[PDB]
From a paper:
The virion can be divided into five distinct regions: the head, neck, tail, baseplate, and needle. Structures of purified φCD508 virions in both extended and contracted conformations were determined by single-particle EM of frozen-hydrated samples; the resolution ranged from 2.6 to 4.0 Å for the extended phage, and 2.9 to 4.2 Å for the contracted form.
At the base of the capsid sits a unique opening, centered on what would be a fivefold symmetry axis in a complete icosahedron; it is made up of 12 copies of portal protein gp45, forming an opening through which DNA is ejected from the capsid. Thus, there is a 5–12-fold symmetry mismatch between the capsid and the portal.
Author numbering:
A (entry chain C), B (entry chain D), C (entry chain E): 19 to 382, 389 to 469
The structure:
Amino acid sequence: MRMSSGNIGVYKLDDSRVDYELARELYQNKNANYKLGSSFVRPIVNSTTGFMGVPHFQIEDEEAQYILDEFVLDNTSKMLKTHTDSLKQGDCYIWITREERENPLYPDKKVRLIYNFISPEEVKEIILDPTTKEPIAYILESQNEWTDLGENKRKAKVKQIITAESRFVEVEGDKIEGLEEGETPNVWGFIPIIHFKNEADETLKYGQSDIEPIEPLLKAYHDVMLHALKGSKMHSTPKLKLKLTDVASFLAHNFGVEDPVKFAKEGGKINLDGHEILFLNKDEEAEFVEVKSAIGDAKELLKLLFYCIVDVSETPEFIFGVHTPSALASVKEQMPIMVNKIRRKREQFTNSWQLLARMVLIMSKYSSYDVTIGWDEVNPRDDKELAETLEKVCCALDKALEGGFISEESTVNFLAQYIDTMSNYISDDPEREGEREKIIKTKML
Amino acid sequence: MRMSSGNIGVYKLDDSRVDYELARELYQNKNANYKLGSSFVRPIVNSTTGFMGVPHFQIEDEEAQYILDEFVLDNTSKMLKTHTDSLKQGDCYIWITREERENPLYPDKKVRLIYNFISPEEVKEIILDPTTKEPIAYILESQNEWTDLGENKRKAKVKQIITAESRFVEVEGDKIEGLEEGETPNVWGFIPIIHFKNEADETLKYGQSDIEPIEPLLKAYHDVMLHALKGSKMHSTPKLKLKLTDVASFLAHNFGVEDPVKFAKEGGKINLDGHEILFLNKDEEAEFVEVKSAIGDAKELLKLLFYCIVDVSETPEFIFGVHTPSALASVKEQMPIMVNKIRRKREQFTNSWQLLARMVLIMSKYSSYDVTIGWDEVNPRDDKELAETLEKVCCALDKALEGGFISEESTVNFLAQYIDTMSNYISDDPEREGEREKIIKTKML
Amino acid sequence: MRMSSGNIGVYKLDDSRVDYELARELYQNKNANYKLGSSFVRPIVNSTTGFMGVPHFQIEDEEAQYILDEFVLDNTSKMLKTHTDSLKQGDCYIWITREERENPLYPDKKVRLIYNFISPEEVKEIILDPTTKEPIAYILESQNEWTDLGENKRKAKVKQIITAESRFVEVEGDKIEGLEEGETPNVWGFIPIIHFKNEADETLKYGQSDIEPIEPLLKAYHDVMLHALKGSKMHSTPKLKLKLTDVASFLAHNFGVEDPVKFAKEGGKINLDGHEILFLNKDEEAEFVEVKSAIGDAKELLKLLFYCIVDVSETPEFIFGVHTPSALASVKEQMPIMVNKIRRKREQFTNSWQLLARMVLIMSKYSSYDVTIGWDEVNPRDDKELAETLEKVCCALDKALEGGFISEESTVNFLAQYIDTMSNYISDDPEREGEREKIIKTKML
C-alpha cells in the first residue's frame, strides 16, 4: 500500500528475538497449542538444511587450504548443524576456541580448535558499534546446575562478557573448576564468535526463523484439526434414540438401572454387544440419531491451509508428496525449484562462512585469507555425462589448430573441475571423502 | 513467534530423558494406549536405520586400518544395532572393554575388544565438566536377579562409577564372582564409553527419539481407531426392531423366554439362524434400525493423521505405499528424498563413530588417529555405469597431451574408487565382504 | 514422551518368553481366537525367511572352508529352518553333537556332526554369567512319551543340565535305551548350543517373534471379521414379513402348523421353494424386512487394520498383492524395500552363524576360526549384465598404461566375484550347487 512522502516515523533498528524455546518446541512437535499443526515444521527445515549441505572452503594458498581441510574434516557435522539451528531458531552462534588441553584420548592433536555452539538464549545482549553495526561485546549468561562426582548437588549462575580487547567472566554460586573469574586478555583482537543469521534483514538486529512465516498457518491448522477431532469424537458415532412409553421401567428391566439419576451421576455406562434385537410396543419407536458428516468442510480448509503452508515455505511438492502423489512421480522434474530455493538460501550464510574460515586461518603467515565457498550439489550430475562432455571437449580441441594455448587452459581447468566433481560423493555431506582420498594417495603413493 | 529483547529467562541445560521403556513399548507395539496407533513406529525407525547402514572406518595408516578392519568384521551387527537403539530410545551407550580371559571357544583370540551395550536405563547420571560438557563420570546402576547354577536364586543391586582415573563398583546383595568391589585404576586415562545421541541438541543433555515428534500423532491415531472400532462393534450390525401388541407373550411363545427380565439380567441370547420369516398381525410392525455409517468421518481423520505422521518422520512415501500405491510405482524416482534424509541423519552419529574408532585404536604407536567415516550407498550405483564412465575417462585421456601428470593421479584415484565401490556388496551391511576378499586374495594370491 | 533425570526405577533384565505354543498356533492358523485374523502371519514370516536365505560360510583357510562346505552341504535345510523358527517363535536353539555311532545306512561317514534342534520349550532355564551375560548352563527338560517296539507304552520325564564342564542328565520313569544318567564331562570346554535370537534386545534375556508386533492387530482383525460374518449370517438374507388378519389360521392352512408354539419350540423350519405367489385380503400386507448393509463399515476397518499390519511387519506390498493389485505390476520396482528389510534382518543372525561355524571348526589345528557370513542375493544380478561390466572393466584396463600393478589385483578379484556369483543358482538356497560343481570339476577334471 502507498503512503505520502511525509507522514512516516523515524527509522529504528528492531532488536526483537525469535522466542527460541517456542521454535524448538514447534520443531520437535511438543507445544500443546501446535501439536496437530506443527507437523510441517520438521520436513520444511530439514529438507532445506539437508539439500543445502555444507560449505566447501576454497582458498588458493595451499597451507590455508590444508588448515581448512583439517577443520572441515573435524567439523562437517557441526557445520550442517549450524544450518539446521539457524533455520530453526533464527540465530545460531559459533564460538571458536583454541585449547592446548593435554589428555590421553587425543595424543595425536596437541593443540586443537573447538567448534563450540553458544545457545541463542545464552546471548543476553549484543553490544554493537553504532556506525558499522558490528559487535563489540557479547553478553553470555547461563544457569549451571550440575552434580559433583561425589554426592553434592551444585548450582552456579555464570555470566561473561566477550569483547575484542578481553573477555570477562563472573559466577555466583558453586565454583567452576574450569573457569577463572575476572578479566583475561583476548589473544586476538577480534571477538571469536560468528553470528549466523537466517533471513538476515537490515532492519532487524537478530535473524528470523523459517517457522515464523508459517506459524499463524500452523496455529490455524492445529485449531481446525483439533476442532474436527473433537467434533468427530462427540458426533461421528451415531446415537441410538429410543422413544419409550416409560423410560425408567425400561432401564430397570433391560439394564438393571434401578436409579437412572444416580447412574448418570456416577458415570455408569450401559453395556452393549452390538447384536441386540429390539422388542417394542406399537407406540414405542427406535431410531438412530446420526450425522451426515461430523467434520463437514474442515477437510477443505485443512487442504487450503496446507497449500498456504507450502506456498509460504516454498517447499517443493515432493517433500510433501504424501498429500500430493503427483509430485512423487517427477522429482527430477521438481529439482529446478529446489535448486532455486537453495541458491537463494545459501547466500544468507556464505558470508558468515567466509568470516568463520578467515577467523580459523587467523587463529592458526598465509598469503591470503579470503575464502570462496562451494557447496554440495542440489541436483547431482552423473559421472557418465561429465565424462561424455569431457570427450566432446577433447575431440573438439586438437582441431582448428590456430586456437593457441587457451585450449590447454580450458582443458586443464575442466580436468580440475572434473576430478573434484567426480570424487565428491553424492550421498555424503561435504568433501571429506575428497580430502581422505587425496591424503591416502599422498601417503601410499 | 517474536518477543522483546528483554523478558527472557536465563539459559539452563535440559537434563530430561526419553522414557526409554515407553519408546521400546511403542516400537514393539506393546503399549495399550498406542496399540492401534503405534503401527508406524517400526517402519520409520527401521527404514531409517537400514538405509543409513553402517560406517566405514577409513584411516591412512595401514596398521590402524587393519585394526579397524578386524573391529568392523567382529562388530558390524552391533554397529547397526547402535543406530537402531539411538533412533528408538534416543540414547545409546557403547562400552569398549579389553578382555584377556582364556576359554577354549576362542583359542585364536588371546586378547579381545568387546563392543558392550550399556542399556540407557543403567546410566543413572552423567557427571559433566561444566565448561566443556565432557563427561567425567558415568553412574551405572542395575538390579541383577540371576539363578545360581545350583538351585539357589540370587539377587544383587549392582552400581558402579566409571571415571577417567578409575572405576568404582559396589554391590548390595548376592556377591558376584566376576565383579571385584571397590576402586580399580583405569588402564587408559579416558572413560571408554561412547554416548550415541540421536537428534543431538545443544540445549539437551540427552538425545531425542524419532518417536517423540510423532508420539502425539500416534496417540491421536490410536484414539480415533479405537473409537471407530468400538462404534462399529456397537452399531455396524443393524438391530432388528419389532413393534408388537404384546412383547412378553411373543418372547414366551417364539423363544421360550417366559421371564424376560431374568433373561436379560443373566445375559441370555436369543438364537437366530438367519432364514427367519415373520408372521405378524395387522397392527404389529417390524423394521431394521440401521446406521448409514457407524464410523462417519473417522477415515478422513485417520488419513490426515497418517499424512501428519509421514510429514513429521519425513519418511519417503514408498515406505508407506500400502496406504498410497502411487508411490510404489516410482521408488527409484523417490530415492533422492531418502538420500537427503539419510545424509542429514548420518551426520548426527559420524562424530561418535570417529570417537569410537579413535578409542579402539588407542585401546589396542600409530602415525594417525583421525579416522574418517564412509557409509553404505543409499541409492546404489550400477557397476556397468561406473565401468562406462571409467572407459570414458580413459579414452578422454591420452589425448590433448598437454594435460600433464595429473592424468595418472585422476585415473589411479578413479580405479581406487571403482574397486572399492564394486567389491562392496549392495545387499549386505558394511564392507566385511571387502575385507574378506582382500584377506583371501593376500593369502591365496 | 519425556521425563525428569531422576524419578526412574533401577534397570533390570527382562526374562519374559514368547509363549511359543501361541506363536506356532498363530503361524499354523489354529488358535480359535485368531483364525480369521492370523492369515497374515504365514506370508510375513515365510517371505522374510525365504528372501533372507541361508548364510555362506567364508574363511581363508582352505581346510576350514572344506569343513564348512561339508557342513552346509549336509545342513542347508536346517539352516533355513533355523531362520524360520527364530522369526516364528522368537527363540531357536541349535545343539551341535558329534556321533561316532556306526550304522549300515551311513558306511561313508564313520564320524558325523549332527545339527540338532532343541525346541524352545525344552529350555526350562538358562544360567547366565552375571557380568558377561553369556550362558554357563542350559536346563533342558521334556516329557518323553514313547511306545516300545513290543506292546508296552512307556513314559519318562528327562531333564538335563548342559554346562561347560559337563552335562548332567537325570530321567524319571521308564528307562531310556540310549541315555546314561549322571554326569559326563564335555569333550570341549564350551556349551555346544547356539541361541538364535530374533530381534535381540539388550534388555531382554530371550528373543521376540515377528508375530508379537502384529498380534494385537491380528486379534482386532479377527474380531472385526468374525463380527462381520455373524452379522451377515443373521441379517444379510432379508426376512419376509407378513401382516396377517389371523397368523395361526394362516400357518395351519398353508404350512400345516397346527401348533405354532410347539413348532417354534422344536426348531421346525417352514419349507419354501422360491417361486411362491401370495394371495391376501385387502387388509393383509406382505413386505421384505431388509438391511442396506449387514456389514456396514467393517470393510473400511479391516482395510485400515490390514494397512497397520503391513506397516508393522514392514512387508513389501507385492507379498500382499491380492489386496493391492498395483503392487503386482512393479515387483522389481518394489525389490529395494525388500533388500533393505533383509539387510536389517540378516545382522540379527549373522553373529550367531559366526559362532556356529566357529564351534563346528573347533568340534572337528586351523590357522583361523573367524568366519565371514555371505548371503543369498535378495535381488539377483543378471549374469549377462555381470559379464557386460566384466568386459567394460577389461577394456578399461590395458590402456593408460601408467596404472601400475594394481590392475591385475583388481581384475583377479573381479573374476573371483564373478565365478561365485554365476555359479550360485538363484532359485536354490545356499551354495550347495557351487560346492558340488567344484567337487565334480576337481574329481573328473
